[PDB]
């Protein structure tokens, strides 16, 4: 698990607009990972931008870590 | 194992100068991976360049796939 978590964080931090991973909760459902995470974003991004960054994160992380079968990503202002 | 192999190939293909992964043999030594691989390179690169590309591959792949504890990388001309 720690290895997979590190990969998740690393992958999310490489997406344009991510200001760190604020929270990540991952669990195994069998051999699959289900995860929920919160990213920081620029407070001055629009809500639509923040939604776009979240969807980019989801795409990036799921594309890199094939065992993830469910990933929810939300955003919070971070300075 | 197949998952780790895919990661190895993907990581090697992203290094400047790699013209595919020609061969990859990976084995588990306990929970660690030991691997030997051959990359393609431009026939017109110098032997020194090809050595540099191999060392870049080793660095890239070991940095991405933490379970690898031994990785030998050689090069062959590829068109
Ligand atoms: Ni949308
Ligand atoms: Ni040297």
Swiss-Prot record, chains A, B:
Region feature C-terminal domain (CTD), mapped onto this chain: 2-79
Chain residues that bind Fe cation 3: 76
Binding site for Fe cation 1: 36, 72
Binding residues for Fe cation 2: 51
Tree of life domain: Bacteria
Miscellaneous comment: This bacteria makes up to 60 cubo-octahedral magnetosomes of about 45 nm in diameter which contain membrane-bound crystals of magnetite (Fe(3)O(4)). Expression of just the minimal mamAB gene cluster (MGMSRv2__2365 to MGMSRv2__2381), including this gene, is sufficient to form a minimal magnetosome chain with small magnetite particles.
Protein's job: Essential for magnetosome formation; required for stable accumulation of MamB. May nucleate iron crystal formation. Probably binds and transports iron. Binds divalent cations, possibly up to 3 Zn(2+) per dimer in vitro, probably iron in vivo. One of 7 genes (mamLQBIEMO) able to induce magnetosome membrane biogenesis; coexpression of mamLQRBIEMO in a deletion of the 17 gene mamAB operon restores magnetosome vesicle formation but not magnetite biosynthesis.
Name used for this protein in its record: Magnetosome protein MamM
Provenance organism: Magnetospirillum gryphiswaldense (strain DSM 6361 / JCM 21280 / NBRC 15271 / MSR-1)
Classification of source organism: Bacteria, Pseudomonadati, Pseudomonadota, Alphaproteobacteria, Rhodospirillales
Full-length numbering of the shown residues: 215 to 292 of 318
């Amino acid at each position: 698990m720690e290895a997979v978590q590190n990969r998740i964080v690393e992958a999310a931090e490489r997406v344009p607009g991510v200001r760190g991973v604020i929270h990540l909760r991952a669990r195994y459902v069998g051999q699959d990972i289900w995860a929920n995470m919160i990213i920081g974003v620029d407070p001055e991004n629009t809500v639509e931008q923040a939604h776009e960054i979240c969807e980019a994160v989801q795409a990036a992380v799921c594309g890199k870590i094939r065992r993830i079968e469910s990933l929810h990503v939300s955003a919070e202002a971070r300075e």
